[PDB]
Each structure stands twice: as C-alpha cells, then as structure tokens.
Design a protein around this ligand. Structure first.
Ligand SMILES: [Fe+3]
Length: 807
C-alpha cells in the first residue's frame, strides 16, 4: 500500500463526511509499466477513507494497493459520484514523495465524456515522456480542444477561438448593433474564447446575449473572500449600481453638473448625498460596498486619489501634465521628434493636407533654436492626430461629445524634465489652431482647456489601446493556444500558465459589461459606440515583437540602441520613470527565461522538434491573431533564441506592462479633472457667453468641457475596482504552489529570480529617494513612482506587479 492524502476545497468555500464512503474514487496510473496495449497500467478504484493546510482546504487519507508489478505512479483518474462539485487541489503519495498539483474543479462523473486525469509534477517535452504516459498526454490535449461546435456549459474545459461578435445587442435595439471585430481586413482583431450561445434573431452574425459568458471551468476563478471577486464587481456596477445612479439623476436628487472644482473634491471629502434607496442598493453588494465609505443611509464618499494627497491643485501645473507622459497611467505613447513640423501619414487623397501648422518661432525652447533642440534630441511629442482624425467627425455628431485630434510638442529641459511648448487642436483639410502656454488671462484658461483635450485623447487611447488591446485582448489568443497545445507536463506550459491567471475570466466579464454595446466604456468615454472599433484600427499596426520594452523605446525614438549600456539601450529622456524601472524588470525576466529554457532544450533542433511547441505557436498566430497571420515580423520557433524571445514578450505584457498601465488608474484618474474621459464642447468663440464664463469662472468652463457628473461617478467606481489588488493576487516572482515542478534546477532558478526582484525593489526605493530624480519621479504632486515595485499588499496601493492580467 501507498499512503496518499488528497487536499480538497468544497464548492462553498470558493463560490465533510459526505466525501467519504463511495463518493470519490481515484485510480492510479503507472508511468513505468504498461499494459498489453502500451498504456500505463491502471489500479483499482480506491475511495476516500477518512478526514485528516490552507484556509478552506480539507485533507483526506487514501491507501492504494500497489505492487512492484505496477511500477511508479505518474498519473491518476478520479471519479466524483457526488452531485456537487469540489475543487481538487492536490494528491501527495508517500512513494519512491510524489506530488500531483491539480487545482481543478471536478464535477459529477456523468457530466464528463472522458474521466478526469491528473499527472504528477514532472516536466517532459513530448519526446521525453515515459512511453506509458504518451497516450494519456495526447488524449488529454485533444479533450481540451473540443470539436468547434456546441454551446459551452459551465463544467466544460474546452478552449477555442471566436471573433468579437458578441458585444452588440441587435435584438434589444438596432441602435445597439456593433461591427463584428475580427475575421476581416476592415476590422482585424485578436480572437477571444468561444462561448457558443448561437446567433441573434435579427443578425445571424452576432452571438446572442447570455446570463454568464462562459470561460473554461478552471479559468473561472473562485475566491475565498467575496471581497476579492473584483471581476464580478464590473458586472454588478453595470447591471445594478449604474441604474441606481441614473435614476437619482433623473430624480434631480443631486445637481447633475459639477459647478466648481470643490464639487468634485467633495466626493472624497464629505461625500455626495444620494437617495436612501440608492445607498441601500449599493451597500449589500459584496465587492461594491468595499468601494466607498457610507453613513448607511445617504452619503457615499470615494477614497482620496493619490494625485491630490499632497497638493490638490498640482495636476494643473504644466510640469505635471508633461511628467505624467513618462510616469503616469499611460507612460508609453510619447515619441521622439526628429523633423519639424510633425508630419501626418493620413492619405492625401481622402484627407487632404494634414500638416502641423505649429511654427518653430513661436516655441519657447528655453533659449534653444529648433535646429539646436532637434539636433540635441530634446524635442518629443504626444501625437494623436492620425489616430483620432478619421473618427472626429463621427464622434462630434454624437450628442454631448465634441473633440479635437491633438498634437502636443514637448521640450526636454537642461534639468531633464519635460516642458509642454505647444498643443495643436485639429478638426476635420485639417482645420487647426495652435495653443501656446499662458500663465494669466483668458489665454491661461484656453491653454488649460487645450490640455484637457489632449488628456481626453490620451484617456481614450489608454483605456482602449494601451490597456484593453495591447494587454487584455492581445493575451487571450496565447492563453487558448497554450491549453489546446501544450500539455500540463510541458516545460513552457509550466513557465507560461502562471502569467495567464484570471485573464480569460476578466475578459468575458469585460465583453459582457465593459466594452459591450451601451456598457461602461461606451457610457463614460468619448468615442461611445466607436470605442472598440477604434482599437481595431490601431490593431492593424500591432507588431508582437515591438511589444518588447527595448524595441518599444527604440521604435518611439525615446531611446537609441547602445551596446555600452547595461541594457543595450540609452534613454534619451534619461530619467523616464516607466522605462528606467521597466528595463530593470525586463532584464530580470530575461535572465529567468534564459536560465529556464536551456534546461529543457539543449540545441536549436530540440525546439524545432517539439511538436507541441510548433503546433502551439502555429495556432496562436494562424488562428489566435489570424487577421495578422501573414505579417513578416512573426518569430518562427526554430532556435533557442526565438523561444526565449517569445516567452519573454508574453511574460512582459501579462505582468509588468499590464501593471504599469493598470494600477495607476485611480491614483491619477480618481480626480476627474486630471484624467477626463470625454470632452463635450469645442473651444468658445469670442463674444459669446461661454467665452466670458472662461474669463469669469474658468472652473465652470473646465467642468463644462469635460466628463459630466453622472458618467464621472461610474468612471471612478470602475477604475477604483481596476486599480485594486485582491488579497489572493500572485505577484511576479511567486507561484501559487511551491511544488509546481519537481525539477529542482528550475526551482533554484526561480528562487534566484524572486531574490533578484527583491534587489530591484530596493534599487527602485533608492531611486525614489534620490534628490536629483525627484523632478520626474515625484513631480509637483509629490507622488513617488512606485508602479513598478514588484511587491504589494492588498488594496489601492499604486505598486505591485501581478503575474498576469488579473484585472
Ligand atoms: Fe487590466
């Protein structure tokens, strides 16, 4: 007999005597002894004996009869005869100890076509699999693929691709019809996980609405504390809290418009007085109640955002506006200008002349001439002109939406901080007006409004492109390809799967409540129905290999290749907080991947020879990012170096890149005037009442231009959810189970990686305490750039890099 202990979590802990008797049987499978058909020998049905660790877990003892004729166990089957599911965590066998790290829900046997199999934590590329286990490895992969047809049920573990044809709602109203994104050249898009609900009545090409948007069962993360189910909070906020708020505004219970900046600051100070019925709707809701402080019957107040914690006015400084382009929520769009004026790439034949009307002579480059500044590489720009100009006429025809496509020119001062020297506002021949900085008079308010247009442009780009497309949407193809093609035993599966946690789940919740027709992003952001459409337009230019941080910096002209530097790249904005810290994290991940991959792949031919690896990458490109499959820049996995690269970029996006652009959202955006999501008014003409209001009451002028009060309450609640780390978050350099592999050489290398992250955090603390770096790393708001610190505790911390796109 071999003694074994099975760790279980009953459903209720994540959503004992009953598990004993003939309720759960395991059957051990040999890794070293085959039956007369080549498969590993299977043992007798053994049941859970007696009750015998973490919270919610329950251990049970089992004893398997096993003889030397059967060899060494490497896998096991399990049949759950109970009516209710449970979460199987692990099995430990006191043999040879052998550990099977399962972490999987197993429903009643009759709900499965194949009996569930789990393998021990040994890592094997396909050719190194114990021959008894080869059949089992192949069959299990096949099972996870499914046959492409059918409506996905709760208990299914099937991974497949579909197009984003599920966001529109044509049967509720044709006004809610939306383009099918993906599968065409007009609208290319990454694929998402297939759900299979079937077509709508009105449109055979739209998937019909559903109560739950399926993700494969073990992608649907349970949580030991309801508090931590942040993902369902987006659903609750769309379906329950947003109605409640909207009724309060229909009822004129509160002013529908902010009139002064203090009205916005009140939200986190005294709160906002809402009807009792609204407060009673909010505070029973388990994730939603954690978002606000309330007096139980009338006041709701929001956390004070980090950006106002020292100075509640500093966001208004030109210094901060520019500083945030290299250390804010969206620190990765700024580019180096190498010729002046900025040029446009829009087609002359359709758009006419689209050239910057900014004149060099109007620019105060602190004493530099244009030629000097350009030659010294001190001119940078934040250019949203070609991105927004094809959409501006359509956006401006939407009620309460009026925008400009913007260009902002920045000069890098002798002290290393950036200076906004000009904002160009253009409307569809591009009608343009250049707004220069001004400290007093109407002119300072027009400059203030011009910065608001630039940040509406930036907010929309951050949410949709930097955040939705480049991390969430881009990563889901790779999650599906990994499960369909790389076995649980495969090294690269063990390396990659940690960086996928909760990604598919939050995306399905997002399609249902955030980026769906009339969802939260269309309600609170400028493009309204054009929002996800615009990210498709930007996806046309997505390049996977450009997602590598060195490549990104070089491509944007904010760094030059330089062999003599620790990272082979010399930053042109020397203390660019995101890049500088980012390069430290990047290098750490690179050393980890470079140590790991040679342990399983000795020569390049080994990579070429891995059938699973070749089918994984083939499908991720051909099916996953199918609309971009024939683009010349796709790596081919023929060498060790190619595999290291592909693994590195996937881990970078999931963790650090996603951290950098995600967790600073409420820190900086919680004050709506700092990060407005929409403009509603174009710039006032002289001689009209609104021009005089700019002069006499610049704050009402600004509040009139930006996101109205009700959209702001919804906007703030979502980005507060999005900026929160849950207590069950697994951070970079950690694993959920310490026995994720039995390979001690890989485990040692992982321990090194974790220690390297601790060293890097120390380095970063020192940078935050460096008096010369204060200008860009803290700025007028005095908020130390802690966004790329690897560790964090729970809550709205403005620090901590998760392993995955978990929110
Ligand atoms: Fe996110």
């Amino acid at each position: 007999k071999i003694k074994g202990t099975v760790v279980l979590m009953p459903k209720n802990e994540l959503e004992l005597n009953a598990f004993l008797g003939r309720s759960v049987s395991l059957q051990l499978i040999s890794a070293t002894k085959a039956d007369a058909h080549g498969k590993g020998k299977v043992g007798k049905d053994t049941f859970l004996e007696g009750i015998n660790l973490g919270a919610g877990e329950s251990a049970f003892n089992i004893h398997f009869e096993w003889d030397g004729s059967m060899g060494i166990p490497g896998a096991f089957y399990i049949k759950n005869y109970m009516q209710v599911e449970f979460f199987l965590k692990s099995l430990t066998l006191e043999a040879i100890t052998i550990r099977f790290v399962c972490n999987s829900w197993v429903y009643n046997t009759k709900l499965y076509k194949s009996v569930r199999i789990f393998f021990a934590n040994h890592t094997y590329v396909p050719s190194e699999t114990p021959a008894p286990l080869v059949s089992y490895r192949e069959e299990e992969l096949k099972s996870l693929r499914g046959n492409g047809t059918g409506e996905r049920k709760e208990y299914d573990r099937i991974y497949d691709y579909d197009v984003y044809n599920d966001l529109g709602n044509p049967d509720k109203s044709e006004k809610l019809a939306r383009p099918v994104l993906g599968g065409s050249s007009t609208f290319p898009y990454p694929r998402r996980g297939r759900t299979g609900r079937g077509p709508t009545v009105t449109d055979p090409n739209t998937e019909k609405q559903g109560e739950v948007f399926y993700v494969p069962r073990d992608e649907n993360l349970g949580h030991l504390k309801s508090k931590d189910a942040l993902e369902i909070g987006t659903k609750s906020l769309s379906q329950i809290v947003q109605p409640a708020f909207e009724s309060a505004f229909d009822l004129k219970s509160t002013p529908i418009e902010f009139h002064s900046f203090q009205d916005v600051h009140d939200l986190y100070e005294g709160g906002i007085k809402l009807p009792r019925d609204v407060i009673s709707t909010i505070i029973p809701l388990p994730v939603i109640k954690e978002l606000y402080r309330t007096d139980g019957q009338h006041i709701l107040k929001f956390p004070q955002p980090h950006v106002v914690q020292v100075s509640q006015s500093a966001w208004m400084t030109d210094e901060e506006f520019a500083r945030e382009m290299i250390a804010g929520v969206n620190p990765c769009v700024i580019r180096g200008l190498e010729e002046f004026p900025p040029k446009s790439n829009l087609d002359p034949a359709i758009y006419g002349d689209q050239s910057s009307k900014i004149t060099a002579d109007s620019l105060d480059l602190d004493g530099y001439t244009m030629d000097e500044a350009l030659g010294s590489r001190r001119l940078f720009m934040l250019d949203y002109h070609d991105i927004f100009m094809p959409y501006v006429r359509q956006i401006n025809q939407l009620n309460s939406a009026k925008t400009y496509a913007t260009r902002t020119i920045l000069f890098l001062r002798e002290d290393g901080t950036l200076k906004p020297v000009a904002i160009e506002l253009s409307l569809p021949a591009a009608v343009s007006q250049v707004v220069l900085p001004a400290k007093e008079g109407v002119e300072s308010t027009i400059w203030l409004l011009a910065k608001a247009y630039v940040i509406v442009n930036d907010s929309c780009y951050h949410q949709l492109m930097s955040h939705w497309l480049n991390t969430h949407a881009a990563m889901e193809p790779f999650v599906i390809a990994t499960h369909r093609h790389l076995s649980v035993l495969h090294p690269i599966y063990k390396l990659l799967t940690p960086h996928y946690r909760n990604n598919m789940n939050i995306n399905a919740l997002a399609r249902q409540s955030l980026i769906n027709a009339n969802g939260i992003i269309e309600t609170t952001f400028l493009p309204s129905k054009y929002s996800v459409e615009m990210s498709s337009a930007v996806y046309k230019n997505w390049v996977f290999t450009d997602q590598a941080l060195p490549a990104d910096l070089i491509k944007r002209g904010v760094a030059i290749k330089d062999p003599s530097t620790p990272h082979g790249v010399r930053l042109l904005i020397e203390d660019y907080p995101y890049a500088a810290d980012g390069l430290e994290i990047w290098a750490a991940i690179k050393t980890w991947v470079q140590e790991y991959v040679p342990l399983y792949y000795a020569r390049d031919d080994d990579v070429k020879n891995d059938s699973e690896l070749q089918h994984w990458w083939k499908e991720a490109v051909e099916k996953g990012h199918g609309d971009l499959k024939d683009k010349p820049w796709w790596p081919k996995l023929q060498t060790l170096e190619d595999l290291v690269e592909v693994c590195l970029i996937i881990i970078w996006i999931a963790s650090a890149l996603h951290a950098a652009v995600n967790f600073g959202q409420y820190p900086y955006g919680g004050l709506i005037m700092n990060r407005p999501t929409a403009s509603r008014r174009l710039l006032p003409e002289k001689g009209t009442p609104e021009y005089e209001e700019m002069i006499n009451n610049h704050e009402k002028a600004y509040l009139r231009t930006i996101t109205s009060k009700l959209p702001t309450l919804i906007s703030l609640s979502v980005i507060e959810i999005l900026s929160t780390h849950a207590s069950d978050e697994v951070y970079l350099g950690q694993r959920d189970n310490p026995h994720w592999t039995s390979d001690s050489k890989a485990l040692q290398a992982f321990q090194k990686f974790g220690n390297k992250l601790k060293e890097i955090e120390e380095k970063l603390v020192r940078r935050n305490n460096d008096p010369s770096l204060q200008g860009n790393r803290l700025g007028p708001v005095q908020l130390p750039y802690t966004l790329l610190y690897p560790s964090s505790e729970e809550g709205l911390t403005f620090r901590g890099i998760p392993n995955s796109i978990s929110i």
